[PDB]
Design a protein that fits this description.
alpha+beta, seven-stranded mixed β-sheet, 7 strands, EC 2.3.1.57 (chains A, D, H, K), acyltransferase (chains A, D, H, K)
């Protein structure tokens, strides 16, 4: 029912709505302020940037569900950072797992990447637990890495390798 | 009330800004000349899209009525300071929104941008405003003599400041 | 009262264009009465950010465009500017000139903080001269054969008023 | 009833029609071929060119009657070339004289020019005669100056001075 | 018939040209590849707006139906020569317009542009066309061997010419 | 017959976009199935005048977009080009592939005057290989672990046909 | 005689720069005495083709740079221009001013075909005023508190001469 | 013996030396890091910027002594910020006073400014005292305004008016 | 003599041109203002590098001494006409080079550019020059009244012409 | 020793950087590919002149010998963090400069830029370096698994950090 | 002893000398006028133009002997125009034949062209004869194709095919 | 040992130019031997930041330029690149080819982390083919009439080696 597709210009109002939402951006450690012009101009600037892939998640009705991105793609080290957002209106519906899996499938069976990592707030243990269930393993506990909502917070860095993903049921 | 919200300034809000920027009574509070063509306004908006040294906000109520403006300018990333300025449109002055909005600006400055100090300038001839700022935590650090030419004469302004530690400590 | 001075905007350019191509009106400003809309618009674009001028349009209560007021050659050091005004032909004789000259001086002296405002007026327009004298302007020059207008060289008066005089 | 006004972008379809008419352009010794793009691009290029003035002739109904141009305006020598066209549909109505006079009035009472000259085909003696009646005097008979409709033709160069025009009835 | 007219190519005629330019049967007469996107067509039209070395015409009948094309290219202003090429759209071939249109091109070339020589190339394998050109005054000056690759093989073309003096002398 | 090959146009880009983001279809061309419309359009603009390629779309009698045919890496000296084709999923199995491969060869050999046309096809797609052999192509290479596709390196056949063979 | 007026050139800009940063000299032109060489040079580049001005340098017999003469705000319709001159401090008092003012008028009236030349001179410089009167200029204005100079507003005379008067 | 002159391109190596000196830049609350390219490119960018005047101080030998700048020149309010530096090699020679006076003379008798202000570290009381002796008066004590050498410091804002300066001995 | 040669103007010849262009006595013969900075000269040279409507020549003797200039301007490729203008430097006037150089210009115009008509303008007040042009084949076709303002008054000029057929026929 | 100094990278230092950047043994410490043409180096230097997110330093001794490099990168002005990286040229390794230089970088970061956190990455296979960083105050916060491909295999790195409060507190 | 090599920027003074020589350019039907700037600017413009190859001929001493060009290279028709020049100082030394052969060898064994053609003045029968001896055959006699030295002249078009060249001694 | 591979620099372009215009040398790369220095330099400028290639020059102990090694068409997903090499004519036969091919593979496999390196070699150059086989390359294609060289179409071998094989 859910599909990942490349981000398009017609999706920018949806992204704009998410990029200005303080609750949502706190999951990405980003400042929740971005005019449509800043957004669109940065989109235009990165059209041909091969170090990133930005996806939009749609359901059968073509409703915009969320965002999935692979960024800082390095083609010597074969690594990238994965990040995801599910719009407020669609959270708690169980979609996260399916989407994490789609992103790993893209990273490992299409982009031929070796390693995917992410960052998650230590204070968000249920997100940590979900990522662990999806195969990610903690490789770091970054101390006071990000200033979020009035104080410095710690985050976990978690990763998964291509060989582990491609072969786990073998 | 608490159904007031701060959000990033957008191009669709420029007619509202143009109307405030050409109002002699409103612009005197910012020590600015009340003349700005829409083209100057807009071209300056375009120029500063990616300028990280400022954050411009519009204030709306629950019905999406534009209430006023809030700006954090001269943001300095070594000294961690910025100047705060605010305008409440004529039709909304005196309703009790000022303190809420000052508090939202401080919240943004101190819990999101992680700044150390916020300062403002206010006419000595507006002692009710000086008073309100004091009750909101600001303290006079300067009485600038004949700093600005406004409505036919040189006027004095108070410079007032509040620190992050004071704001977050209660 | 209900006459208002406001910044010139792009939507007012058709009205400016009509005045700029009117020979009778441009004669008061010593200017050639020919200007395509493209020339007008392109110059307007060129000067959006030019701090040396302020162009205003005058509107009444019904938003009808009344005329035009401009402060040009604004000088940063000497604190002087030239003033010029046009009242659309249909709105003349209604006594608006005096109110508008006064608004321009108020803007110059209470907002831009200028020291001196001067203007040029044809010697052959003694009613305008008399009107400027009533508003506080004084002759400081009689410029001989300064401009070629309708076939001959003509004289103009230069007149001025200072901030100290106006603010009292 | 007739008026001269500056040429405008909205008049270009009318001009285009004249610039592609072989009968009409033969009076200006011009090739009757010009795409709308060439026309418009040259118009854009000369917007600020002070060496020319191009006028359109309208009647009370705002119908486009003809064209009048002053070109090669030289501000040391104080001279310019005058040329005129009356659309086919409006020829023989007696308008030519009034328009020649308006052009001289513009040249001599507005632009302060000293001399206006023109060129007319020797084989167009009725045009020569009209110009003479309007005060122009022959100062040259240019031999095989222009190739027109299959052969080289001679043209008269005719002129009038500012002093003669301004003072003739004095 | 004589109600056919030649006029400058305009942007609004480009869909008609695109249709001829992508027709294998039509483009073989000009020894050109029958592939041209509308964007290539149009961008090349834009590039050559001010190119004085060519004149492109469209042919219309009294009802404004587009009949074909006539081009004078490689116009050389020292040697006074140009190449003539023509296309009559499929639906209008065989109606007797060809001779009229050839004559109009020659008229333009010789009575307006004042050229000395017009030449063309025509497939040796189209002897009826060679014949028609001869009756219109053209004379063979070359038989170019395996000059063009067309429909799978190298073909020969005749080069034919006519001079201004011959055309204007009767 | 009523299938036609014609130059790719701007109005056909939504159809190309749909194929370019389809994983199943791009797998046949060894290409990543991700391309925003802006990237597609901007590249199209970039290559308008690039003589080294010819991109065609295939249409039926009703103007329905059938697929895509491309001749790329056209070389000026060696007179070679790579051929590639896609038939939209709904139009496959209708036997159009053979007609279209033939149109592409006709264009390459009777119009562009090329000497050699080659293509790449997955070794794991022996029906496509068989189809190319029937149209006159012959294997000249078996490229080992040439492309990473759906999680592993795969082999492809390189196949070619010459102008002399086709024109007889 | 052996004083010559010629077009300002790039190689003369160091000499102009020295005058432009001299407070005593720029006081005669009512101008701020601060101008980096880059500002000077960039403005010079900007105005290469500006027909509204003519800038000349004055040289003696030995090619020594004597001063500067300029005709500015040249108007196409009214046939007027403002004249201004500077004589380097070491070359003043040698009686060159009169010869040079005359060369400037000759250029204005016998070459540019202008109708009127005007200038501004400080009221507090009555020797310059007297010198201009001797060369045919006449006062047409006494401009009140026109320029801020060395700490206070000062008055200047506007003076003019016409082509008809000079050519007789 | 000392002279103020406009900053020139040939003075930039001297300025570069000062802009990278930690002791010197601490007096201006600036970060002591600036490549020659950043310096020169910013110089090029501000050549025509009328909101500043930058002077170099030379002695009779044309040795580079120091820097004096008037910045943030506002032409409605008629104010500017004054700042000065004396190269390490020339400090304690008594030059400061003469230069402060030259800068005020420029500001008040040439630029026609109404007010000149400055900032000085509270922890630099001997500089404060010098400025007071030269006529400046404290109008502010800015609390933790600048992060300097490991901590936030307070600075005095001090000013002098045109009327006081022009008339003091009258 | 016949060891004089005409060649294309080059950048290395610009100091020589600048010297003629700033000479009042030399420029009066071309009815041009004698003021041109080297930068205007050179930038105009740069602008017209590819301008096919003119041909500028310098004249040298056997020792490479620069003798003067010859220009063919306003070259029109339909009408086949151009204006000829010449300058012989002061030190070389009166030596008998003028006729040779006029003849070389005509040769270039008629045997190389294939023009039909060459014309020039010459001051009525220089009858010796008018005479020389007549002996070189030119014939008066116009006496332009008060055409140019030169040295304080409006002057008349003769317009003279010669045709290709006349020049090549002997 | 303490006669080592840190200063901004300049264009004249680029040959020195090019030599380090093309050294396989040196670049392995930064997990970077050891290939960079001088033109790539320089054009990237030009591009980042005004990039406030980095500070690049060269290290010199008293005689002006270039010792190595120190960089503070990914400077984030909300989170107050940056990555520290260092290179000591081959000829100077093992002399005891490393600790001094680490201390200078920390001093710059914490007493000038006012940052909150400095982190680095170091090869797990270089335990002597890990040890030295620990003695300089850094603490491991991550052990990144197969993070970088270096010399034929995927290697692990430690991520280590130090906070401003810890550094300034003694 | 002779070699063909690509034209280089250092060869342009040699080419300039030839392009301004009337005797030499008459062999190419070109106007003998070209400033160094026009030459160099056109060279810069065509650096990447694949439709031409321009060669310079050098001997063992690296003396510049002549020019050989292949132009209008068409890659569908596989044809090009060949043209050659031997400097005056090196004519009549027998080099022409060797160079014609080198050019054919390049065209047929390197560029893989099908046909090479040229143009030669009918009035230059010894050049015609040389080309015939080198294998070229007349395919056209173009009537009054070029205006050269005062009149229209005829030229031969001559060609040779790849198959004939590659196989003649087989 | 003392042969070294390093990034191509601007100062090495005269040496590249000499090889690029040598017919005998460019024949090994199937390239037209004509390239002005301006074309070479302008392309070099164009590709400064192109991540899809790495061009190296080979130097000996005395800094003498030995030859050239290039890795081109580097692909980000498939982890493949084409390898090509030239040894200056005076330095051939000294046995340097083997050492250099090995350096290129080391760079490709231990630094760029590529999976596959392939090359093309003329079938009519069996000594080069034998040399590549000795260095671990294996034929995966015999491309028929792929390139037009010295007057006729010629065949080339495509050969490859994988990272797993080289790293063992």
């Amino acid at each position: 029912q859910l599909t990942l597709r490349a981000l398009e210009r017609g999706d920018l109002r949806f992204i704009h709505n998410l990029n200005n939402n303080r609750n949502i951006m706190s999951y990405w450690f980003e400042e929740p302020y971005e005019s449509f012009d800043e957004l669109e101009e940065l989109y235009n600037k990165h059209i041909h940037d091969n170090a990133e892939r930005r996806f939009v998640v749609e359901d059968a009705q073509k409703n915009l569900i969320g965002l999935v991105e692979l960024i800082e793609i390095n083609y010597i080290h074969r690594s990238a950072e994965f990040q995801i957002i599910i719009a407020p209106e669609h959270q708690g519906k169980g979609f996260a797992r399916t989407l994490i899996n789609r992103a790993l499938d893209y990273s490992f069976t299409i982009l031929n990447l070796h390693k995917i990592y992410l960052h998650v707030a230590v204070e968000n243990p249920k997100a940590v637990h979900l990522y662990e269930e999806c195969g990610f393993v903690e490789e770091g506990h970054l101390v006071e890495e990000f200033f979020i909502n009035g104080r410095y917070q710690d985050v976990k860095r978690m990763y998964i390798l291509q060989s582990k993903y491609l072969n786990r049921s073998e």
